[PDB]
Structures are given as C-alpha cells and as structure tokens.
Design a binder for these strands. Structure first.
Lengths: 219, 221
DNA sequence: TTGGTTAATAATATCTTAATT
DNA sequence: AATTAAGATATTATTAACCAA
C-alpha cells in the first residue's frame, strides 16, 4: 500500500496525497525525481505516480525506477493526452498512463487494479513457506529439496494441520488408483520428509498418531 | 503470447484479430461468452480482450470467470460506452484495463504490450544478459549469441515469467498457433537449443527443469 | 503387530541427435 | 528454422527386505 508521488504542482501533489491516504494507502511525496529516486532506494513502493512533464527525463525516469526497484509499478500522469505521448510513455516502460486534469475516481480504480494480487495457494507457517505452485519449500530462507509425492504429502498435511490424516486418506488424496499401490509409500514418503527437513533442519513437522495417522505439528 | 478476442461485431472482431496477428500474436476469436469460456478452458491465454457489451453475459461475469479460471490471464475490456462509472465497474470487476471503442489500434497495441511485459521493460536487462524482443537479438557481456525463432520466443516468455514455472502446455499455447497439433518434444528441443547456445557455452544456469511441472527461468541464480 | 528405514529396481520423465522439412 | 523420431540418460515411484519397538 505504499505509493509515492512525483509532481511539481504543489496543489496537485497535496490533492493526490490526500486522496490516496483517504483510500488507505501509505504514501510519500516528492516534487522532483532526485528526491524520488532516494525513497525507492530506502523502501519499496508498490506503485509510483509521476508526471511526464523539471528535468524532463520522464522516459529515463521510468527506466531508472524499473532498474532500482523492479517490483514497482510506474504510472505516468500528463496533461498532454495525445496518442504520441500516451504511446511513448507506455513504450518507455510505464505500466499505465493516466490523464490530467485527474479523475480521482478513475485513478483510484486503476491503482487498485494495478495492485490487485491473485489469491495464492502458498502456505507460510512461522519461518517456513511451502509453495505448491512452484513446488518449493524454504525454511529460514533456505530452499529444501523436497518434491514429488513426498511434497504433496507434506502440503496436504499442512493444509489439514492440527488434524489427524490417515494413510487411506493421503493415498486417495494424492495417489491415483490408490487401491493399486503399496501403502508403504506413505511411510517411505514421510521418512523422506523427515529426512529432508525434520532431521537436517532440527524441527518436528510431521507427527504420527498410532492407529490413526499423521498430523502436521510444526508450531 | 496468445490473445483471446471476444466480440460480437463480426467486422470489428476480424479487424482486431488482423491487427494482433500482424503484430505477431497467436490469436483465437470468439463472438459470445460461451465460446469465449470454451477457449478459456482448452487453451491458456496471456490476455483476453472482451467487449463489455456482448449480446449476452454480464461483463462483470465474464471477468470473474476468466480471472478465476486463469488468475494470471490479463483481462482488457473494450466498450463504446466509456463513461467513468463503466470503466470503474470493469476495473473493480477484475479487469486490468479498459479502453474506449472506436479503438485506436496504435494505443491498443501499446497498452496490450505494456500489460504483457508483466512489469518489465521492452528490453529485458539482467546482469550482463540482454534480450531485445524488438530486434530478436541477444547479447551477453556485449558478445552476440545467435538464437532465433521459436527458441527465442520460448526464452523471452520464460524470462518474462522469470522465477516462475511455465508448463510445456503453456509454452505451446503462447508461441504455437495450433499447440494441439505439435508434439511437446518441440519444447524440449527448443530448451536444448537454448542451453546449447547459452548455458553450456557461457557456463551459466538459466533454465531449470522441474519434473512434471515444466521450465523456470533462473538466470539470476 | 506397527512404523521406520534402506536399498534395489521398475517406471516414468527429460534430454540429445539426427534426420526431415 | 521447424518438427519428429528414437535412443540416451536422468529422476521418481514403487517395492521389499530389514530393524526396532
């Protein structure tokens, strides 16, 4: 929710900030690029709203923002609304081009859409993240080499944490033709998980409950 | 990049399809929500361009459908009624952009291209790696590498989805006109040519294979 | 018995070439 | 350049023997 605005009109700059704050956005402000590039250096801003028109290096501005702070969105506001200025701003890297006099109902809607994030299937528990989409596990910032069916078994359990899952359940949930395989696979997979993480990373992620099943228990 | 065009006006539909094909995009055409959704189910589209006023089917409904079915598909709404309420509604419904009809195809293509950069610049610059999709050129340390065609498009698509896993089936839908006809091995051969021209000679790790998922660009490594 | 623990080996995936186009 | 065919090679999955309790 961090947006910084680079506008040399004080009125507009004042205006723009008050609108963003009203919406809910943490915001910073600059009247020149010099100061602006400074802020992006200190902390990340989800989006940057800057004027195309003092130094007149907007095309370069977009580039420098994308370089210094690659994850940020650049929105360019310009009173010259001709196709040439629109096309040239987008072609320079701008993620969106808005037109001033500013419609703040439309602007807020575009910023929103520009910072809309898709729902994820990612699981973050304490210093551990488990990303099914990328088949990735990291604890304490280090990747864990766990994949395949052991990966699915761990993720399944994580999704049903504090709940006891049974071999049959895991098999049906993760194994096609579950009635054509050796249940030993579950035990082997659990060992793999303990081996890859529990053991080397000194944690207790999976717990076995006699005659009932396993349960993710990483507090 | 594959673009799904949903538009009832048959004449406009073909004009849009022709402008996109000319640019170099793979394109499918539809004239109703149903047909559109059909395509959304069989093929992966990097971007859907849909009229807010189809003969049937709430525009908001269409946006939700595509966004849920394919969260990473960009949605762009076109409407001759382009008052503020309409634009804001579409954006809030989940659209990433809203453009007024009659379309200025110069600005349309500039905006489509800005959405498909996934936040990037036109010229990808990573470390001493340069990938210029505009000149189909690649440089490393200012030294030129000859890589063109499908392999070039496979690599640029990966590097734009960098650090993400793109499946063989996604690479095909994005670069091949008829992904169903071609064999998935074509992707593996392209990845071999990419490694054969870059990773091996330049001693770098750019494409990571992830078994059963696909390929991921990891040049930063 | 129950679970875990190893290890080999069968499956399955991906890659690399060479040819054809 | 583009696509495929086939074997080469890599990587999981499966299976079972084995151990401890």
């Amino acid at each position: 929710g961090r947006i910084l605005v680079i506008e040399d009109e004080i009125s507009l700059n004042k205006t723009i900030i008050d609108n963003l704050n009203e919406f809910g956005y943490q915001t910073d402000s600059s009247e020149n690029f010099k100061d602006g590039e400074y802020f992006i250096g200190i902390r990340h801003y989800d989006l940057v709203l800057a004027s195309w028109n003092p130094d007149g290096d907007g095309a370069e501005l977009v580039n420098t923002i994308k370089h210094k702070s690659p994850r940020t969105s650049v929105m360019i506001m310009s009173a010259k609304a001709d196709k040439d200025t629109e096309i040239k701003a987008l072609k320079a890297g701008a993620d969106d081009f808005v037109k001033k006099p500013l419609d703040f109902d439309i602007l807020l809607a575009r910023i929103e859409a520009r910072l809309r994030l898709g729902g994820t299937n990612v699981i973050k528990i304490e210093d551990l993240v488990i990303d099914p989409d990328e088949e990735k596990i990291t604890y304490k910032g280090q990747d864990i080499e766990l994949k395949g069916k052991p990966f699915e078994v761990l993720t399944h359990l994580a999704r049903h944490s504090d709940q006891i899952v049974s071999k049959e359940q895991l098999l049906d949930a993760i194994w096609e033709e579950p009635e054509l395989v050796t249940p030993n696979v579950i035990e082997v997979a659990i060992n793999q998980i303990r081996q890859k993480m529990d053991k080397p990373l000194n944690i207790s992620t999976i717990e076995t409950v006699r005659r009932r099943g396993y349960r993710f228990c990483f507090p």
